[PDB]
Design an enzyme around this catalytic site. Structure first.
Site, PDB file in Angstrom:
ATOM      1  N   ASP A 351       0.926  -0.588  -0.240  1.00  0.00           N
ATOM      2  CA  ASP A 351       0.226   0.075  -0.261  1.00  0.00           C
ATOM      3  C   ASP A 351       0.426   1.179   0.425  1.00  0.00           C
ATOM      4  OD1 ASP A 351      -1.961   2.208   0.449  1.00  0.00           O
ATOM      5  OD2 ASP A 351      -0.823   1.276   2.755  1.00  0.00           O
ATOM      6  N   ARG A 560       4.275  19.687  -3.904  1.00  0.00           N
ATOM      7  CA  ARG A 560       2.775  20.740  -3.677  1.00  0.00           C
ATOM      8  C   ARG A 560       3.436  21.529  -2.645  1.00  0.00           C
ATOM      9  NH1 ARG A 560       0.500  19.286   0.374  1.00  0.00           N
ATOM     10  NH2 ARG A 560      -1.582  19.578  -0.253  1.00  0.00           N
ATOM     11  N   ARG A 678      -6.509   5.295  -6.365  1.00  0.00           N
ATOM     12  CA  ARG A 678      -7.998   4.840  -6.223  1.00  0.00           C
ATOM     13  C   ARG A 678      -8.746   3.402  -5.820  1.00  0.00           C
ATOM     14  NH1 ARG A 678     -10.128   9.718  -6.573  1.00  0.00           N
ATOM     15  NH2 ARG A 678     -12.674   9.896  -6.821  1.00  0.00           N
ATOM     16  N   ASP A 703      -1.455  -0.756   6.135  1.00  0.00           N
ATOM     17  CA  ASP A 703      -1.448   0.174   7.849  1.00  0.00           C
ATOM     18  C   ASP A 703      -2.985   1.010   7.910  1.00  0.00           C
ATOM     19  OD1 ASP A 703      -1.117   2.206   6.070  1.00  0.00           O
ATOM     20  OD2 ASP A 703      -1.021   3.895   7.482  1.00  0.00           O
ATOM     21  N   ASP A 707      -6.872  -1.633   3.690  1.00  0.00           N
ATOM     22  CA  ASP A 707      -5.607  -2.751   3.409  1.00  0.00           C
ATOM     23  C   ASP A 707      -5.561  -4.662   4.639  1.00  0.00           C
ATOM     24  OD1 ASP A 707      -4.285  -0.740   2.250  1.00  0.00           O
ATOM     25  OD2 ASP A 707      -2.527  -0.420   3.894  1.00  0.00           O
TER      26      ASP A 707
END
Ligand SMILES: Nc1ncnc2c1ncn2[C@@H]1O[C@H](COP(=O)(O)OP(=O)(O)CP(=O)(O)O)[C@H]2OC3(O[C@H]21)C([N+](=O)[O-])=CC(=[N+]([O-])O)C=C3[N+](=O)[O-]
Ligand SMILES: [K+]
Ligand SMILES: [Mg+2]
Ligand SMILES: [Mg+2]
Ligand SMILES: [Mg+2]
EC number: 7.2.2.10
Length: 994
Positions: A351, A560, A678, A703, A707
């Site tokens: 993940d 960002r 997504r 985590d 998941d």
């Protein structure tokens, strides 16, 4: 109320019948609690009950040995009329081993879960509701929240239930949903309905989900769903339905037992059939039991003699030490055979947010203005080391450490980051880490200031608690925050109004610090600051800024970005209205550009290298995130899943893209793609399920709550120490320190464990073969018994039992992780390896009977009998003509049996050296490599010389001290077993495969 997201706010209030201002009437609350129940999940069943001891006896190897213990117990209890211990000892010591073998099993996972429960301490969840009881907001128990409850939430609050938003009191509402949707950035919520049919939670931006966190702002909503019906509860039942098979190692040991259970049934009927003519008809003897089933009884006993008996203990031992090794690497393991499952993994599904990344915003890049020569514009760019909210890290310019203080532009850049900020940094002294207070985007700025330290403040002797906001509290002593202009969507920026404090440098007036989206902030700039001086915003300067911002926004270092500016001459505060936020953008004009910071959710530093080490080992890593595709691809390119300029297209799929593909085309896309973004929690398990459809042992690393079903579906689940509770329960292995490089170490371990396991299995099974051959050859030639069961019991558990344990410490190869994972269908013991130990096993059986026979005939110390006298020793009697000059007690002498036992224990010490490697000669790979083995050889041999000379032991094992010359004979029989295995190894090296 399901699908509350697709309905209007007034439509939701009508479902339960409750005013938005008043709240739920106690009459309604009492009715809404009996029709929906308490907002909680069923009790946590992480308790190892005493009924889970039968799980330790599901291994058929233990069951075979248990069955062999019962069929060895019965025939000695009601027969022969002898209550001696020799026949009684083995029955209960086998049972004594098995009960002790189950002890470590139910203690390991018990000790494990007690460490997993320690990872998350008790912090009782609460909630704030509005009811008709009291007009003021009342903080009640989270479990006592019913559907239809008017609930308000604020910054920092954990959402108590699945809530439909009614009204946002602040301008904007940001919600952190990382633990549920894997979304790297917080989401801005609205109140309008979402009429999307196939909408995922990530599309439902009009509702609050239980378990998530409020980043900024406040709002009041209506509870539409509680308890196990919530998005968390749906997953709890989703993984509850998820079922997994036994671990690859456990089921690979089982098939070995099925192969051993066959030869146990084979030699049980073989001895029974070769004695035909005597059976199938009653003969003189055994009339009490019709059919004369005496031959069946001796056949069963011979079948039990084939079981390695000590084996189910030496295996659990090997896994036990391999477990605490991982514990040293801060890795908690649930089940014992789960320590190997990572050594035969073909695909590691990971993940993203929280697992591959720290899930903690970090400013890594940062620039200001250096020089403005009209047409020429240069910048001062800096890099910031770090990946967490911790104030640990240094500022670099051109990869060289610099002091941020000697840059006037950076001092002001910090001043904006500290003042234009509604978030702080806190040190969780319980978990021993730094945690954010509010929005992650702002906390990153807080961390940046603490790392920069523009005023060069000494902070060495400060605790981690007061270190979190040390450098920021220095800045906040300079200016006084009068008020703040909150974030708005139409403007996409915010600002604060600050006046000087303590009358220090009162020459300057009030100021106004601004931060927001670059293009929007810069368009409202007319000046750029060059250190301490200001110059007009020129075209070239404007371009030089936007070019770098656009560069930082994409490509190699997708970030960002955030522009930082000040308003040198702000309006008088009486001429500013703070009622309408549509006025705010106008207040934030005529600005002075200072600088821009670049941030991202960064990968963990051990992740990139780990992926490469997995690739070199032949383990394909696959990212499965619920975050947007753009971020996923960017992270993949940083860690090494994708190349810097590699064309992805249909090597990466989204939820809809994958859900639009037909089932046939869906599973085929799981062997090509390496990035799914997504993604619903349902798809994660499906991807795992598809990889398992191609018979691939796949792992899962996560985590978050999304998941959990995938962590359970995989052959081995790996949960992060800083993850959700459900993720920890759904997994077998838990990284206690979030170290990703532990996984690759658990791969090397699991490969070293399996290899060594094949060795001491071949080692122990070969001994029992020799014993069966010995017992059979004795009955075949009519010779005196060479080995009694009490001796073999001691041998298989002690003398060659613990040298097999020392074989679990065989040094890992260099080519251990340069080779692909082993084949799933590939058996633990092969036909070739079967013949291999059967050949040395046959030699052991022939050597043992030959050693005893040597003493009877050709040994000078012996009686020197003929072969006929030896084969008719039962016909011996006092003064028998065919046995002249011989006492018939010579056939019960302990001396020839000592030969057969000393040749057995010695031939195993030699076999132990051959069991070091599988195909490597002792000339190539010397026997003095494993020092743990040599120690076991000495100790066991020490006991062998102790079991002969002590005096009481020879009286219970029927033995006697061996002669000084007779020991030389033992070596002349034991040593050739080396040459035998060396031959077998010789036609294995480049002759079996070449
Ligand atoms: N489309 C948008 N809608 C709402 N806010 C936006 C936005 N785009 C940018 N921002 C705001 O612009 C910044 C840069 O966008 P960034 O992270 O590079 O995204 P980009 O690629 O440029 C656009 P993309 O979505 O089409 O891909 C962001 O910082 C804050 O709000 C964000 C913020 N926060 O938590 O995200 C918190 C915050 N406070 O005060 O807590 C303030 C932000 N801000 O700008 O002032
Ligand atoms: K698992
Ligand atoms: Mg036995
Ligand atoms: Mg995650
Ligand atoms: Mg973007």
């Amino acid at each position: 109320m399901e699908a509350a997201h697709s309905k209007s706010t007034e439509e939701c209030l009508a479902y339960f019948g409750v005013s938005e201002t008043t709240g739920l009437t106690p009459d309604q609350v009492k009715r809404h609690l009996e029709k929906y129940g308490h907002n909680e999940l069923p009790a946590e069943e992480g308790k190892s009950l005493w009924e889970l001891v039968i799980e330790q006896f599901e291994d058929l190897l233990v069951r075979i040995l248990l069955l062999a213990a019962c069929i060895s117990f019965v025939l000695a209890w009601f027969e022969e009329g002898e209550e001696t211990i020799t026949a009684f000892v083995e029955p209960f010591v086998i049972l004594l081993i098995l009960i002790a073998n189950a002890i470590v099993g139910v203690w390991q996972e018990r000790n494990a879960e007690n460490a997993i429960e320690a990872l998350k301490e008790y912090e009782p969840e609460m909630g704030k509701v509005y009811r008709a009881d009291r007009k003021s907001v009342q903080r009640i128990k989270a479990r006592d929240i019913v559907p239809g409850d008017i609930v308000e939430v604020a910054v920092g609050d954990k959402v108590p239930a699945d809530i439909r938003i009614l009204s946002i009191k602040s301008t904007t509402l940001r919600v952190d949903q990382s633990i549920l949707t894997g979304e790297s950035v917080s989401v801005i919520k609205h109140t309008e309905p979402v009429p999307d049919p196939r909408a995922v939670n990530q599309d439902k931006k009009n509702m609050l989900f239980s378990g998530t966190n409020i980043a900024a702002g406040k709002a009041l909503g209506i509870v539409a769903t509680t308890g196990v019906s919530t998005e968390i509860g749906k997953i709890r039942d989703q993984m509850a339905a998820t079922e997994q098979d036994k671990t690859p190692l456990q089921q690979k040991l089982d098939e070995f037992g099925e192969q051993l259970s066959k030869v146990i049934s084979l030699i049980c009927v073989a001895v029974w059939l070769i004695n035909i003519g005597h059976f199938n008809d009653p003969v003189h003897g055994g009339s009490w039991i019709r059919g004369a089933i005496y031959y069946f009884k001796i056949a069963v006993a011979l079948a039990v003699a084939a079981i390695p008996e000590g084996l189910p203990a030496v295996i659990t031992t090997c896994l036990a030490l391999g477990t605490r090794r991982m514990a040293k690497k801060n890795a908690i393991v649930r089940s014992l055979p789960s320590v190997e499952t990572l050594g035969c993994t073909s695909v590691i599904c990971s993940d993203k947010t929280g697992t591959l990344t720290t899930n903690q915003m970090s400013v890594c890049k940062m620039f200001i203005i250096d020089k403005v020569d009209g047409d020429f514009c240069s910048l001062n760019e800096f890099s910031i080391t770090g990946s967490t909210y911790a104030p640990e890290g240094e500022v670099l310019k051109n990869d060289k450490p610099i002091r941020s203080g000697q840059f006037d532009g950076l001092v002001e850049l910090a001043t904006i980051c500290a003042l234009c900020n509604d978030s702080s940094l806190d040190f969780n002294e319980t978990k021993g880490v730094y945690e954010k207070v509010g929005e992650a985007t702002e906390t990153a700025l807080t961390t940046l200031v603490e790392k920069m330290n523009v005023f060069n403040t000494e902070v060495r002797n400060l605790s981690k608690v007061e270190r979190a906001n040390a450098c920021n509290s220095v800045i906040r002593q300079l200016m006084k925050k009068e008020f703040t202009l909150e974030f708005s969507r139409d403007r996409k920026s915010m600002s604060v109004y600050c006046s000087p404090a303590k009358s220090s440098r009162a020459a300057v007036g009030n100021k106004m610090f601004v931060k927001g989206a670059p293009e929007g902030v810069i368009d409202r700039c007319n000046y750029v600051r060059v250190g301490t001086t200001r110059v007009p915003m020129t075209g070239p300067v404007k371009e030089k800024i936007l070019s770098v911002i656009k560069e930082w926004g994409t490509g190699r270092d997708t970030l960002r970005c955030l522009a930082l500016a000040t308003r040198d001459t702000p309006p008088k505060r009486e001429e500013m209205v703070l009622d309408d936020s549509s006025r705010f953008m106008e207040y934030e004009t005529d600005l002075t550009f200072v600088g821009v910071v670049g941030m991202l959710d960064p990968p963990r530093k051990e992740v990139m290298g780990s992926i490469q080490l997995c690739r070199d080992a032949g383990i394909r890593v696959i990212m499965i995130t619920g975050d947007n595709k753009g971020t996923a691809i960017a992270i993949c390119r940083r860690i090494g899943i994708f190349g810097e300029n590699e064309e992805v297209a249909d090597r990466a799929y989204t939820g809809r893209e994958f859900d639009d593909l037909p089932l046939a085309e869906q599973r085929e896309a799981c062997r090509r793609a390496c990035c799914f973004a997504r993604v619903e929690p349902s798809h994660k398990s499906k991807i795992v399920e598809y990889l398992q459809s191609y018979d691939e042992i796949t792992a899962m690393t996560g985590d978050g709550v999304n998941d959990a079903p995938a962590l359970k579906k995989a052959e081995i689940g790996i949960a992060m120490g800083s993850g959700t509770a459900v993720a920890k329960t759904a997994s077998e292995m838990v990284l206690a320190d979030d170290n990703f490089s532990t996984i690759v170490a658990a791969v090397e371990e699991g490969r070293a464990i399996y290899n060594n396991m094949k060795q001491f299995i071949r080692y122990l099974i070969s001994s029992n073969v020799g014993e069966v051959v010995c017992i059979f050859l004795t009955a075949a030639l009519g010779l005196p018994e060479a080995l009694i069961p009490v001796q073999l019991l001691w041998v298989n558990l002690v003398t060659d039992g613990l040298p097999a344990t020392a074989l679990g410490f065989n040094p890992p190869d260099l080519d251990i992780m340069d080779r692909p994972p082993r084949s799933p269908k590939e058996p633990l013991i092969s036909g070739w390896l079967f013949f291999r130990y059967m050949a040395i096993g046959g030699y052991v059986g022939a050597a043992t009977v030959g050693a005893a026979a040597w003493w009877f005939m050709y040994a000078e110390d012996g009686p020197g009998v003929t072969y006929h006298q030896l084969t008719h020793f039962m016909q011996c009697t006092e003064d028998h003509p065919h046995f002249e000059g011989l006492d018939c007690e010579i056939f019960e002498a302990p001396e020839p049996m000592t030969m057969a036992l000393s040749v057995l224990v010695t031939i195993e010490m030699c076999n132990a050296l051959n069991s070091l490697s599988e195909n490597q000669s002792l000339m190539r790979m010397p026997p003095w490599v494993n020092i743990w083995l040599l120690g076991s050889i000495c100790l066991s041999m020490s006991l062998h010389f102790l079991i002969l000379y002590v005096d009481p032991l020879p009286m219970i094992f029927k033995l006697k001290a061996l002669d000084l010359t007779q020991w030389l004979m033992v070596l002349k029989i034991s040593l050739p077993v080396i040459g035998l295995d060396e031959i077998l190894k010789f036609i294995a090296r480049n002759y079996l495969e070449g």
